[PDB]
Amino acid sequence: IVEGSDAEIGMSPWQVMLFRKSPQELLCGASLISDRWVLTAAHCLLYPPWDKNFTENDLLVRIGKHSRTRYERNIEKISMLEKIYIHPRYNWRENLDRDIALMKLKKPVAFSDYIHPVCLPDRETAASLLQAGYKGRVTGWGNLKETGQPSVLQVVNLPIVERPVCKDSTRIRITDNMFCAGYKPDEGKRGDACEGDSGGPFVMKSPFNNRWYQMGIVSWGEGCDRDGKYGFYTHVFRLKKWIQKVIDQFG
């Protein structure tokens, strides 16, 4: 997260850390959606142009954390994965279309002050909130500049951007399965996600019912926080039926 700040404690209790068992390293963000399911970006697990293909036993997830590296005793939860599900239409070659994955945990997790699921959006919420100019919020332990990593969880708020602007900003083919967010160069304020923040949630607070909803997954970018350049996020409401099916089919 570039140009953000430290998170308050419990500020993002659905934030999840995707960890590799060996070497013990942080791969990505992710998010807690049920007591058995975590949602990340597919490229965190599978990215064939670099021969990345992580098994269920390659990884852990860590929930409830704030410190990046330190074991947060009686606060965090470490869970082993039962099964990984990647979207069948995930396009690793061209544009990271449908950059989304679900990981089933070996056992259900107990919620707490620090560990708590975020909501996925319904149609009405989504229609209402996915509008250019509205700000949402991105969190992660990814990098602070583009050329190092944060002591604790970083948060930043950024506005959703009109699709024609997003389309003109990048060379890459963009699908309606992805949206972009960020400030424009003449808006003054700055901020972005960066490497390591993939799978982390782009979220919005519903003025209608006070709940936080996950509208996006941190997917990709070109640099981090470059003028004219915007962070790209997996459009979560577009892929919600896949999420539903998988859960209901394999829970």
């Binding site: 308050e8 404690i9 419990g10 500020m11 209790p13 959606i33 919620f111 707490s112 002050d113 708590h116 699921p117 975020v118 909501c119 996925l120 909130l129 100019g133 509205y134 700000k135 949402g136 919020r137 948060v155 708020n157 506005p159 919005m204 607070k205 519903s206 003025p207 006070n210 709940r211 936080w212 909803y213």
Partner: peptide, 26 residues
């Protein structure tokens, strides 16, 4: 079920330091 309502924020009616920024954006 319970989703979206943070124990240390919404369940106490306590706001985080930057959430208004979002709400003013609507």
């Amino acid at each position: 079920a319970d989703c979206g309502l943070r124990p240390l924020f919404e369940k106490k009616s306590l706001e985080d330091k930057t959430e208004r920024e979002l709400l003013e954006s609507y």
